[PDB]
């Protein structure tokens, strides 16, 4: 009786005279017991079934008179010395563990409560782990990390944040259960611009700024990530654009920064950007994650960024242009033996033979590994089937088979259509080629299916009509198996048959009609091949292929970075070791700029001496 | 497009005409809800994520909020 | 202006169907063409008149034609009225019955949106669904 009436007072708020009336009435009732008395006015002013107290009810259920009732319920607890043990209660539910009235007020935007509970002693890292919290869903629950700070910082509340900041107890590093400190937290909940109006970029740099160490960035999550790796592996590109491109301005926190600009005379300026966890040299880096996920679909943004777009060019012109070029010149002397072994078919052609096994099992365990490791891949399955031909045809020719040379062309006829992957170095081709196969994936199928069902209805129908037997001529039989005039049929729609009007038939003229049909039908649907491609190709393959070669690219140039040995790599590791601040010494790469349109006197800069040395 | 996706919906109701009345009232989509103190009405459930608009959410049903 | 005075004198009888069938939610219906021509002001009055009158009187009654508004907003092809009608959010906690969209839940940006189908669904005759699919004027 008297804790629902409570709880009601409390949701619908229309007095808190009749609360303090109330509230009267329970001290009357407490002042009975003489001890066990902040247990029973607890289990009398909290709900057992979910562990709900009636300041989480007010919370919960807003209204313009609140202030005035959780001042009035904190007073209460302070009279009665239940203060700490009333505010930093939680749910004992499975799904809203951990749930504390601070989160309620931060996931409604109340700023005055929250401090009135921070001041009365609120334990502000309650960490909410419950399913709702952190599901497996997205359209089930919301995860913000797991804490107060963390939820004030994706809700955009920058006054709670500096609040909860500002608090001593506030602990900065907290660790949720998923590993994810607050920054990784941030990257979950950072879907884009047009979403979300770029705030969670700001309270990334609030927060990083408050607390000027390299801790948070350096902390790695149970899945093994540093935020900066989570945002290449989740798709965040705002984010990751933000990090990998800071300039700070602060003398103080000048080490946190990673673009940093070591000369500028004038609208030139050279800036000198970071390599630490970028650069293939430490393992799951940046580049790695960005290029060896298909899972994203938005890596065209996330290597447009500068130092990974340089890093790209720059090892294509250091090794991976020769590299190409080589292996592009194995491949054409292998099929060319390959070709003159098929046309001409001892000592010459034994040791090409001898070359072409050699070469074979090399792409053979290649393609092995590639597949056991793992439309990009497609390539690597037709290189497996033309080295299995290849291997079956030099092992058939051995014995006395005769199938051998069915094994072996159509490896070769299948070679040569693999020269295709290597017309990727140039641009025009290599969009040219990303064209082809994204034509004869989306489009040319629907063409070729139902081009292959008129055959084979309108072929048995013209067979049909032949079963009038060739009556001792099999020439004036045409049409007669259904392969002939399936046959016949493709020979029309190209243009090499003989249409004419047949003699032994029952219906000739059912034949004509049928067969103009036929070709007309093949014609109009020639032509809505020809209308969807026009319609679907535009902005698409114009965009989308670069979009896709340009990522081949970029894969191909990591795996043959990962081909090297350890001595080349330390080699060709890009990038200059400079003094970014005092005591420290970093790997960093340097662009120059050129930028007209905003003047200012360059204060922040490394090199006094503006120019290359 | 216009034209599919309105010959599918036209084919949907079809096949749903089709059915016989047990059969719909097992697929009868929906579920039964209590919007407001004395009604009890079929709705339908959608779920939606908003970032641009920041509000303090005073009209609601549900005082727990997750799914149950 | 004139609407508040028509609908706050005493005599007025807001139900009132003329010789077609056609109350005044009816009528607004019939005269809601589209928003580059009128500017999207059929729906203010629309919430007006129906919040005026905290009732499911007027979207009840059906015309001669057999049809209430939200069938014959279906009927006629009439779009940014319907969408005002099937999505509608009141904050008033007085005229909460009148809703045709609620929130059962919000922790967030997250928010459970709870639409209702009682004339929509193809449950009950001539629903709307079918109104909007089988006919192609």
Redesign the interface.
């Known amino acids: 009786r008297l804790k629902k009436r409570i709880f009601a007072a409390v949701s619908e708020g229309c007095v808190e005279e009749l609360v303090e009336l109330l509230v009267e009435l329970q001290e009357l009732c407490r002042r009975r017991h003489d001890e066990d008395v902040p247990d029973f006015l607890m289990h009398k002013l909290t709900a057992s079934d ?1 562990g709900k107290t009636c300041l989480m ?1 007010a919370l ?3 209204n313009p008179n609140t202030k005035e009732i959780v001042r009035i319920l904190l007073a209460f607890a302070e009279e009665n010395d239940i203060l700490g043990r009333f505010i930093n209660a939680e749910y004992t539910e499975e ?2 563990e951990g749930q504390t009235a601070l989160n309620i007020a931060i ?4 700023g005055d409560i929250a401090a009135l509970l921070i001041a009365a002693g609120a334990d502000v890292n309650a960490h909410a782990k419950g399913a ?1 919290f952190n599901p497996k869903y ?5 995860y ?1 990390g797991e804490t107060p700070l963390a939820l004030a910082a ?3 509340q920058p006054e709670i944040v500096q609040l909860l900041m500002e608090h001593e107890q506030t602990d900065i590093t907290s660790r949720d259960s998923r590993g994810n400190n607050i920054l990784h937290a941030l990257v979950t909940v950072a ?1 884009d611009f047009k ?3 770029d705030f969670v970029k700001r309270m990334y740099d609030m927060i990083l700024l408050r607390s000027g160490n390299w801790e948070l960035e350096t902390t790695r999550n149970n899945d093994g990530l540093t935020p900066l790796q989570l945002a290449a592996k989740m798709g965040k590109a705002e984010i990751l654009k933000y990090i990998l491109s800071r300039e700070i301005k602060e003398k103080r926190l000048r080490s946190l920064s990673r673009k940093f600009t070591d000369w500028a005379y004038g609208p030139v300026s050279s800036s000198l950007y970071d390599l630490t966890n970028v650069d293939t040299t430490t393992d799951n880096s940046v580049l790695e994650i960005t290029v060896y996920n298909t899972n994203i679909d938005n890596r065209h943004e996330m290597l447009t960024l500068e130092p990974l777009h340089t890093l790209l060019h720059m090892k294509w012109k250091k090794f991976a242009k020769h590299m190409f070029f080589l292996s592009f010149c194995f491949y054409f002397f292998y099929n060319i033996t390959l070709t003159l072994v098929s046309y001409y078919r001892g000592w010459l052609q034994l040791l090409g033979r001898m070359f072409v096994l050699i070469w074979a099992m090399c792409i053979s365990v290649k393609e092995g590994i590639a597949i056991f490791l793992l439309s990009d891949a497609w390539f690597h399955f037709v290189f497996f089937i033309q080295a299995v031909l290849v291997i079956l045809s030099v092992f058939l020719y051995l014995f006395a088979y005769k199938e051998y040379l069915a094994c072996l062309v159509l490896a070769m006829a299948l070679g040569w259509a693999n020269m295709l992957y290597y017309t990727r170095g140039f641009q025009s081709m290599g969009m040219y080629s990303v064209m082809i196969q994204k034509v004869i994936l989306h489009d040319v199928l629907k063409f070729l299916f139902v081009y292959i069902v008129f055959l084979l209805g309108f072929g048995v129908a013209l067979a049909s009509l032949i079963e009038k037997c060739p009556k001792d001529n099999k020439d004036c039989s045409s049409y007669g198996s259904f392969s002939d005039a399936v046959l016949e049929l493709f020979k029309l729609t190209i243009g090499l048959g003989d249409l004419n009007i047949q003699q032994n038939s029952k219906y000739p003229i059912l034949f004509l009609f049928l067969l103009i049909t036929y070709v007309i039908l093949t014609f109009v649907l020639l032509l809505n091949m020809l209308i969807a491609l026009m319609g679907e190709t535009v902005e698409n393959v114009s965009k989308e292929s670069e979009r896709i070669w340009r990522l081949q690219r970029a894969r191909t140039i990591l795996e043959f970075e990962k081909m090297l040995p350890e001595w080349l790599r330390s080699r060709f590791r890009m990038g200059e070791l400079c003094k970014v601040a005092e005591d420290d010494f970093r790997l960093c790469l340097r662009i120059n700029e050129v930028k007209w349109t905003e003047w200012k006197t360059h204060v922040s800069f490394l090199n006094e001496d503006p120019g290359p040395v």
Request: include cysteine; proline fraction near 0%; charged fraction near 25%.
């Open positions: 979910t009810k919960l259920n807003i799904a809203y996931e409604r935007r109340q709702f997205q359209h089930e629950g919301f913000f994706c809700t955009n879907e979403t979300q109006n």
